[PDB]
Amino acid sequence: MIKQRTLKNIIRATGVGLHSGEKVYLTLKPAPVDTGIVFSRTDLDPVVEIPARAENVGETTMSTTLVKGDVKVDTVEHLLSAMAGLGIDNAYVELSASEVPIMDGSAGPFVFLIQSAGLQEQEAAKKFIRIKREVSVEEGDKRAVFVPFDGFKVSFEIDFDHPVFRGRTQQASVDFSSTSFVKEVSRARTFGFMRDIEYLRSQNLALGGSVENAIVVDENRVLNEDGLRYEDEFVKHKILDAIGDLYLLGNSLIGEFRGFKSGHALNNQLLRTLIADKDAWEVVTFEDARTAPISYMRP
Amino acid sequence: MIKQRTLKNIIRATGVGLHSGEKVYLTLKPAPVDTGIVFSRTDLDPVVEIPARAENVGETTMSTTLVKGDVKVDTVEHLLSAMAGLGIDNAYVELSASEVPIMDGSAGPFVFLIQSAGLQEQEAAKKFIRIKREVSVEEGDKRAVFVPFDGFKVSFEIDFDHPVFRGRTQQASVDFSSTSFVKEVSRARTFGFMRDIEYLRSQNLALGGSVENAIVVDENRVLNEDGLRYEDEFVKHKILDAIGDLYLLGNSLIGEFRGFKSGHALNNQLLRTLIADKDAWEVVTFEDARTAPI
Amino acid sequence: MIKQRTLKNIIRATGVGLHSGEKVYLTLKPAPVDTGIVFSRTDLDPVVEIPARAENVGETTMSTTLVKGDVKVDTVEHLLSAMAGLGIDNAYVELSASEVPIMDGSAGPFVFLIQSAGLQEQEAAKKFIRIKREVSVEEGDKRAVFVPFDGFKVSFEIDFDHPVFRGRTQQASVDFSSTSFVKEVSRARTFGFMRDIEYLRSQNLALGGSVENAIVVDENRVLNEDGLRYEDEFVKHKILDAIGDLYLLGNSLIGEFRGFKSGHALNNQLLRTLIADKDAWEVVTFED
């Protein structure tokens, strides 16, 4: 049987909130079978929990935001990408504030935290969502598509014609496993223009955001002193975001995603569209010695 | 006088439908005086005819689509460009499906079929639509203009800033006083991005679309093994498109067209706007061919 | 005390109207204290006056247009930039038509005409509007912002990815405590594509527009035989426009403006937003 997985131990970490600029306290905890990933606001009394599911998504402006009433948690997608990447089905993510710390702008830190906590296989079948037919959404020139595929494959293309981007890799495809996620995707940082940072920092927004947690460009060049982690870092980050946003489905996906200039809003719209078309997907498990077409890291 | 023209004989051909990926059966037939170009769906019972006229254009998303009720024929513009280019006034176009076959992505195959069918002059004056005053339309950054001109002239400019287009010819003008439609325009293939083909195919659209019927590019380079036919092939295909779309006026044009990033939608809008402005045009004939534009 | 300033003498000029292609007559005249800059349609009877104030701006399609009822004056910003740059508080600008003549497409001619008129210091304190809190507006990808600053600074960035604009300065800052408006900004000409000119002409518009009053480009190159007045002429002209548009506040600014692809419409929207946000600004005079 292909089994569900959680964390072996509790692990804690801290970092700055992108929005607040204040220190946020993060705790990852084990969770029972069929819990999924659940965020909890432990600064609140009573504590408020928000399951990481598509139906709980609120705003999708800059990051993916989860909401329950007036209570929110944003900046969820990078951590969720790491949970998806390492095959973590069940976990609690406790936070002292309304956002997951941005860390270095990638999913790398979260991969390392999960690894440090250790993996624990659980006595319950892992559920997968298999794409059975094509589903797509578009918003202007932006497109996001699911097609059937025996495995998990994520493709993405951006299109920037600014000098800084002309001739750089702007398309990539990853045939997904834990191992191809950790080394080829997880450390890809988010990115934006310095003029966009300037604009947010004026009007006192994104107070924790800097070159320390993003690739920062201007019209002509990359401004980070140490350059890029990967030549394809820009497009790899979009793949990272897509993996994280798609994990709001609540289970590992068996299929193929293709994005063109897609963002959190379109990713979420694609999920909603899939979920509502019951003919386009099925829940599957792999029992009695059968195996899944996706490879995950051994505990 | 300058006489109306039809085909001398029937001619048949086949080609894959861009949309369906299925073989489509095409027949070009002679037609009486004042018929214009009429498309006929022979797969339907009863047969449904749609005159190739500006008023009959439904959608314009990827190609020019003629519509009558729930029946449509799209990808009409490349064939219409050849009819316009060779001066065919009257003809029936019978089709087994909701699209004209895409052939090689240009008007070249239709030039052969029309010329092989032969030209037949008819005992009636050929009517022309002469532009008397400027008319224009815009949509976002896109523009389309008619300007008075003693002849027929089509100018077009595109504006792509992707590396694959930076530096390539993206503007051209053809004055048909001196210049041949067949030699200078007809063989220019349509074009687009491989990422768009991928997407369309995933939607079961463009099931017949490939490098065999388009110039296919990515962000940085032309993907076709043997590259372009002409250096200016991109912008010349836009001129081909304009000539075909403008022939939905129903008559040869005496005037100048100028497009900037104009597509089938804006082209049709220009026609509808022109038609509504009754003082911006007139119909003319030439009892002495010597008085016509060269 | 820092005093208000008007013109010393009346000065006249003529030029082609950008829209009409007709000869337009202009007169600059002194004005009393607290008049501000006032445009006058002196071709009409009775004469119609439109104060150059943010509340009187109508259309912002290609230029800034002032309106009172059905009477308009457009293309005001280049002249206004000159008035602002030379510290002219009070003046009348009389016109024979609904547009300020375009001249050479820059503020240079207006600087020279104002300079020719001479300066007259007046017996009243000059009022400044000081920015005390950040104010911002946005429209699509365009942004305009005021930030507190001890002086006057204009920062601007454009973003064109056409070959003709690549490899040029597309961002500039001017701190007017160190930089001279007259030598570093005022001569920057307006600019646009020849295809845009051709389109306007076919609509019987911009009949007076040409290489004689603009930098004209195509997709790949500058078409003017003479090149550029400054390497950064394009962005400097946007700064020039910003200065003109901002002078519709009615007084000189103490603060910093930052624009990204901001045009006349967004510039005006920023002014109207600032005016309404009373806690973000104050009027100040200087006794010494």
Ligand SMILES: O=C(NO)[C@@H](Cc1ccc2ccccc2c1)NS(=O)(=O)c1ccc2ccccc2c1
């Ligand atoms: O990767 C993201 N979401 O998954 C980023 C995308 C983003 C959006 C806007 C930006 C503006 C300027 C710079 C970088 C930017 C990236 N969204 S985010 O994680 O919420 C984020 C937003 C703003 C930031 C500013 C500066 C550093 C890091 C940031 C991250």
Ligand SMILES: O=C(NO)[C@@H](Cc1ccc2ccccc2c1)NS(=O)(=O)c1ccc2ccccc2c1
């Ligand atoms: O020339 C045309 N109409 O007159 C083409 C324009 C077009 C639009 C979208 C494309 C996407 C990718 C490649 C080429 C494309 C060309 N419209 S079309 O004749 O309907 C057409 C559409 C899509 C195609 C895909 C692939 C080959 C040929 C095509 C033709």
Ligand SMILES: O=C(NO)[C@@H](Cc1ccc2ccccc2c1)NS(=O)(=O)c1ccc2ccccc2c1
């Ligand atoms: O500087 C301006 N306003 O402050 C110009 C901006 C502009 C707009 C559109 C253009 C089209 C083509 C060429 C240049 C252009 C400049 N607006 S304007 O002063 O009203 C103006 C408009 C159109 C013109 C065409 C030709 C020359 C000069 C022009 C000035």
Ligand SMILES: [Zn+2]
């Ligand atoms: Zn679909």
Ligand SMILES: [Zn+2]
């Ligand atoms: Zn750019």
Ligand SMILES: [Zn+2]
């Ligand atoms: Zn991200």
Ligand SMILES: [Zn+2]
């Ligand atoms: Zn591009």
Ligand SMILES: [Zn+2]
């Ligand atoms: Zn075409």
Ligand SMILES: [Zn+2]
């Ligand atoms: Zn361009």
Ligand SMILES: [Zn+2]
């Ligand atoms: Zn200007």
